[PDB]
């Protein structure tokens, strides 16, 4: 909790005081009502409109304001960053520009019109690096768009002005060369806007333990409200009634505030444990939910796999040696600065020690990707090395009066079946072979997925990737299921499906296409290597980027549930024992003889209720330290653990109210205040 | 005298369990939808004739059947009382009851309360007593046993959708349980001195030259079923301290045994329908501990008795101001505790003349919800609401998920349980507050000081909990008190029956899981203690202010 986080929590507590925002918290809302009533009572008594000591209702009101403002502050720490933020997506949507064109064949009148201001039918120009301003269609020019925000993959996809590859998407980046677009959606509903609205708008449920605790809170506060309210008629019949200030103060000091603060106390303890685990949790409920997770949806590219599809194995073409193919690949991808060409170079170097062929400046024209011929390469000396897709090189060979062997295509089909994209290589008019760009799984993951299955957690793996590679990696990692070629809508709908069965889902994603799903999951761990959109949606960020850190997040969730149970016993014992300590003072005014019920020998009703409010405030402040210090995280059966919790924390929660209230009262008397 | 009080409690409980055990195994067949041994052909003929097809009912159909029977009984009884000057069996031509008194008596009897703001000797005529009051004694008892049959079936049935047939349940319960037992009890009461005749009132001329006119209704049958169905509606004004209702100590013993017979047999039956007798034994232990402690407290408080008596000039201070010399002070104490724990209402002593604590403890038992051997059927599903609450808080307190009898408990069940538990104390406190802020309500009181408030509180807490007992000094026969207590009785009874049927509905579509780490055993002393704690703490947190300003204020000075 950096300095700025505390100051923001304080501003948001002050800003949540307003009743419209406090209404959603029953106990603290009643404390708010009573605080306001005692403020009005003190202002009256000070105006002379009501006889009595204004400064005692002033003390009560001040302390109830402190109680409410610290409850708001604890719940602004533990939960104000919880909801998903579509800030990076909104930024991309608000800082986008479009080169509107005139005479849209090609045109040269580039009007730097903000992309948000584009309507359907308008023509736009995009060039290398410029993000696609809005959804639409292509009508001239062919390029390679970086459609990574839709699938999650990083391979550039060719959009080529007429066919089935003709619908660009707003937000995706263009890489290869120029491209003119014909918008096809008014700015209201693009794809980017659709998933912005899908991220902010997906709410996370409440843990069932929290709902049960809320029901208990409301039951107890109804009981205490009935008791305290009907105290007036009864007392009024019995001679001397109970002053209204004592009635409102008794009500707002009898209600279970400890239980109300338990949520934020366990929240801040959980986030502290997570930081300990090298996970940056922004939500306190996320940790307890991690304790209760039954499913684990995973992404594939970047989450499970490294996310760049390094090169795996050069493959001959039935005649050429592997050395020749490796030299050709290392020369073609020599200039390539994407991790895939770099990995081709590295692998060629190690497997065939081709150090000789590394030159910063050799006479050698560099032939980068074009998206017209769809193949990169180089021309070093009387050579034309090219590299690219199988069909691109097929076209190149068939056009150069050559021939395309068939076993090269057999190897291509094989490398496709093994879960890898094959890059065919050519030098002139003779295909040299294939380069199996395979996706490297991050590390030792089968062990950890086995451990997750042993912990009773399903393991789905939804990606936006091919079915071939999806299945290959699902087998090679050990996940239960997998759903390939999934759009963000698909992942979000699958999370809604699962968590509609009453279970708690927990997605782990690293890309923009995971932002919806991560926003809706109960425990959404976003990879720290992921994009800012994925890290803003997810409940928590994983600084190790390991996709199996849910194991440790679940160990800590189960520890926070043991701590929630211990302090729930303490809290229930505390509010009940405090009720017995507080109420005998309220009868002394009605019948003299009922001072006998004042076992604690408190001074007066006024001093008992002032001690009560001070105590309720201090105990709500000190619940956080108590939660931060853990409990004996031992495996104990329900009965034995209930007995241990009862004994230790329940007995503590009985002795705490009596001792605490009496020592606060002793301080009030010795000090002279009351 | 402590040896004799102990012997009384011990013999009571021992004979009680000896009787209840077999009857509970007999009721486990009705809960299981098995025809009792001899009655399976007459069932066919009957149910065919009565239009009853033995088609199962979901929780909504079941609840609507019970509520429809109860509303039909309410209408019929109201109009019977209102127009009883036309109906036969009226030796003393008594007029029809008022609209307020007719309404209050109808609502009270239909809801198993049998609160009495009238005098049965000079108010009702044998037809009303026989054809309306005791018919509704049978019907309300059977409605409560049928609701607990539905709840037990919900707990024991796996992934089903129907809680059995309600018409068959009522017919079985009444014909094969309440009626034969009530007939045996009635003929024993007639042997011991109770009345059974439709003669005109008998004109006695005293041994001296005085005059008397004895009331001569059909007392014994209504007595047997008032006790057996924990109804409590007495034939005469003095409820069952009347020589014509409780003629000897023997009939009084049999009356307390009847008051507790079916609640205890429902606990044994619940134990036997889950194949786990230890569940029924757990409920019986939880109830018996509280019952024994309360009986001891009241016996002690009454044997200490009125301090002023010894000073005024007597030989004992034993409080005999509202007790028959036929049953001592110990027996009056035991019956007070039994009747107000069992949601019965019958009194063999005036609870207004009880000492401070002797009136606190019966009232306190009424106010915790009457789950200690509570009303017929009502007591068991009240204690099941409290058992669900205990399991909820246990799960909350260990961190695992709630679970009772293998079936996991959702948050819908928690909402319904909380609302069901709260509906009664809300009625008690709000009704008592309304009665104490209106001149019509506090003026009814008889005693001054805190005991007047004790009277008002006891009346509203008795009506709200469908007990029927009263401090009886309270002149509660005005339109205000009649309508107030009618509302309290109606809402208590049926606003507790409704969430219970909703909970049966949710529970019957579940499946009992297997053991796990989040399954604390609901037997043994740990859960008995947890359940006693839950019951007593809800009751105390709610009523300690109210009780402090009545019985405790009176006790302390």
């Amino acid at each position: 909790f950096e300095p700025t986080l505390v100051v923001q929590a304080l501003k948001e507590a002050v800003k949540k005081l307003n009743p419209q925002a406090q209404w959603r918290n029953p106990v603290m809302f009643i404390v708010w009502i009573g605080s306001l009533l005692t403020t009005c009572i003190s202002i009256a008594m000070a105006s002379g409109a009501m006889p009595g000591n204004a400064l005692f209702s002033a003390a009560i009101s001040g302390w109830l304001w402190i109680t409410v403002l610290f409850a708001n502050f604890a719940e602004a720490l533990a939960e104000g960053r919880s909801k998903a933020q579509a800030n990076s997506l909104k930024g991309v949507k608000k800082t986008a520009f479009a080169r509107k064109l005139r005479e849209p064949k090609y045109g040269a009148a580039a009007d730097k019109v903000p992309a948000d201001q584009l309507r359907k039918g308008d023509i736009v120009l995009v060039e290398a690096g410029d993000i696609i301003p809005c959804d639409g269609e292509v009508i001239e020019g062919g390029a390679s768009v970086d459609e990574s925000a839709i699938t999650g993959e990083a391979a550039p996809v060719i959009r080529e002005s007429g066919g089935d590859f003709a619908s660009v998407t707003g937000g995706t980046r263009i890489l290869s060369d120029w491209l003119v677009i014909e918008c096809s959606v008014n700015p209201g509903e693009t794809f980017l806007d659709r998933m912005i609205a899908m991220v902010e708008g997906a709410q996370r449920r409440k843990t069932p333990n929290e709902i049960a605790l809320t029901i208990l809170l409301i039951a107890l506060t109804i009981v205490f409200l009935l008791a305290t309210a009907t105290l007036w008629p009864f007392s009024a019949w019995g001679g001397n009634a109970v002053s209204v200030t004592v009635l409102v103060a008794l009500l707002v000091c009898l209600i279970p505030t400890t239980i109300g603060g338990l949520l934020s106390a366990i929240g801040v303890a959980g986030m502290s444990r997570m930081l300990g685990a090298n996970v940056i949790a922004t939500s306190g409920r996320a940790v307890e939910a991690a304790g209760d997770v039954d499913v684990l949806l995973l992404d594939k590219t970047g989450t499970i796999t490294l996310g760049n599809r390094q090169a795996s194995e050069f493959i001959p073409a039935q005649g050429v040696d592997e050395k020749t193919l490796a030299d050709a690949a290392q020369l073609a991808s020599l200039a390539d600065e994407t991790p895939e060409g770099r990995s081709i170079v590295i692998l060629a170097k190690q497997r065939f020690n081709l150090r000789e062929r590394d030159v910063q400046s050799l006479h050698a024209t560099f032939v980068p990707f074009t998206a017209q011929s769809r193949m990169s390469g180089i021309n070093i000396d009387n050579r034309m090395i090219r590299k690219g897709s199988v069909d691109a090189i097929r076209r190149h060979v068939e056009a150069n009066g050559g021939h395309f062997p068939t076993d090269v295509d057999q190897k291509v089909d094989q490398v496709a079946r093994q879960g890898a994209t094959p890059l065919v290589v050519v030098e002139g008019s003779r295909v040299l072979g294939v380069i199996a760009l395979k996706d490297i799984v991050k590390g030792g993951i089968k062990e950890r997925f086995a451990q997750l299955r042993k912990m009773g957690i399903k393991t789905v793996m939804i990606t936006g990737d091919n079915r071939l590679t999806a299945a290959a990696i699902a087998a090679e990692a050990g996940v239960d299921d997998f759903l390939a070629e999934a759009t963000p809508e698909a992942k979000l709908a699958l999370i809604r499906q699962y968590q509609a069965e009453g279970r708690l889902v927990a997605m782990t994603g690293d890309g923009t296409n995971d932002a919806p799903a991560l926003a809706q999951a109960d425990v959404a761990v976003a990879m720290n290597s992921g994009t800012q959109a994925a890290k803003e949606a997810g409940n928590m960020v994983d600084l190790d980027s390991n996709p199996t850190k849910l194991i440790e997040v679940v160990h800590i969730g189960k520890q926070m549930l043991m701590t929630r149970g211990s302090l729930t016993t303490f809290s229930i014992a505390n509010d009940v024992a405090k009720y017995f300590a507080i109420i005998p003072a309220a009868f002394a005014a009605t019948y003299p003889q009922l001072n006998a019920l004042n076992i604690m020998c408190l001074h007066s009703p006024d001093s008992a209720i002032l001690s009560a409010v001070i105590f309720n405030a201090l105990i709500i402040v000190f619940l956080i330290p108590l939660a931060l210090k853990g409990v004996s995280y031992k495996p104990l059966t329900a009965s034995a653990m209930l007995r241990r919790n009862l004994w230790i924390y329940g007995l503590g929660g009985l002795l705490v109210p009596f001792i605490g209230i009496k020592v606060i009262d002793l301080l009030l008397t010795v000090c002279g205040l009351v | 005298m402590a040896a004799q009080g102990f012997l009384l409690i011990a013999t009571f409980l021992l004979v009680l369990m000896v009787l209840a055990r077999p009857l509970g195994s007999g009721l486990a067949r009705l809960i299981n939808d098995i025809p009792l041994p001899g009655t399976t052909g007459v069932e066919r003929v009957l149910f065919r004739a009565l239009g009853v097809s033995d088609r199962e009912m979901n929780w909504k159909q079941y609840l609507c059947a019970i509520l429809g029977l109860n509303m039909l009984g309410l209408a019929v009884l109201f109009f019977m009382l209102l127009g009883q000057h036309y109906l036969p069996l009226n030796p003393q031509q008594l007029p029809g009851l008022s609209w307020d008194l007719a309404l209050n008596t109808a609502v009270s009897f239909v809801t198993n309360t049998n609160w009495r703001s009238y005098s049965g000797e000079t108010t009702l005529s044998y037809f009303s007593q026989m054809a309306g009051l005791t018919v509704q004694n049978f019907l309300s008892a059977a409605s409560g046993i049928a609701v607990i049959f539905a709840l037990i079936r919900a707990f024991t049935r796996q992934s089903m959708s129907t809680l059995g047939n309600a018409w068959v349940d009522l017919l079985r319960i009444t014909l094969w349980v309440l009626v034969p037992v009530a007939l045996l009890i009635a003929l024993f009461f007639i042997q011991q001195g109770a009345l059974q005749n439709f003669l005109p009132y008998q004109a006695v001329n005293t041994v001296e030259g005085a005059q008397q006119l004895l009331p001569m209704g059909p007392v014994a049958s209504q007595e047997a079923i008032k006790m057996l169905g924990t109804n409590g509606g007495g034939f005469f004004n003095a409820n069952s301290s009347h020589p014509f209702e409780n003629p000897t100590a023997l009939t009084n013993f049999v009356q307390m045994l009847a008051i507790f017979l079916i609640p205890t047999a429902l606990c044994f039956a619940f134990g036997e329908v889950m194949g786990d007798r230890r569940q029924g034994r757990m409920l019986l232990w939880a109830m018996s501990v509280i019952f024994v402690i309360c009986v001891g407290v009241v016996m002690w408080a009454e044997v200490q008795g009125n301090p002023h008596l010894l000073a005024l000039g007597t030989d004992s201070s034993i409080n005999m101001e509202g007790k028959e010399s036929r049953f001592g002070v110990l027996v009056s104490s035991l019956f007070a505790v039994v009747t107000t724990a069992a949601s019965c209402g019958a009194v063999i002593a005036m609870h207004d003349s009880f000492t401070a604590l002797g009136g606190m403890v019966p009232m306190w038992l009424m106010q915790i919800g009457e789950v200690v051997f509570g009303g017929v059927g009502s007591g068991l599903y009240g204690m099941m609401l409290f058992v669900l609450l205990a399991v909820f808080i246990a799960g909350l307190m260990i961190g695992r998920t709630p679970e009772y009898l293998g079936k996991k408990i959702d948050v819908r069940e928690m909402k319904l349980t909380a609302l069901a538990i709260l509906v009664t104390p809300t009625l008690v406190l709000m009704g008592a507050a309304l009665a104490m802020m209106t001149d019509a309500g506090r003026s009814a009181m008889l005693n001054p000081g805190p005991h007047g408030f004790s009277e008002v509180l006891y009346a509203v807490s008795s009506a709200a909990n469908n007990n029927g007992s009263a401090f009886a000094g309270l002149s509660a026969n005005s339109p205000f008190w009649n309508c107030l207590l009618a509302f309290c009785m109606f809402v208590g009874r049926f606003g507790v029956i409704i969430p219970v049927m909703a909970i049966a509905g949710s529970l019957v579509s579940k499946k009992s899981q297997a053991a796990s780490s989040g399954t604390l055993p609901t037997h043994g002393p740990l859960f008995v203690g947890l359940l006693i704690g839950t019951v007593l703490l809800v009751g105390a947190l709610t009523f300690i202010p109210a009780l402090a300003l009545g019985p405790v204020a009176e006790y302390l000075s």
């Binding site: 918290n25 029953p26 009643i30 809320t214 029901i215 409301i218 506060t221 109804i222 409200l225 | -």
Partner: peptide, 29 residues
Amino acid sequence: MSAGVITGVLLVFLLLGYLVYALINAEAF
């Protein structure tokens, strides 16, 4: 039965209604 007592009664009833509605709608609250 005056201004203050009627205000108190209706406020207590409002709080009871609010708490019962919260209980029935725990999920949101």
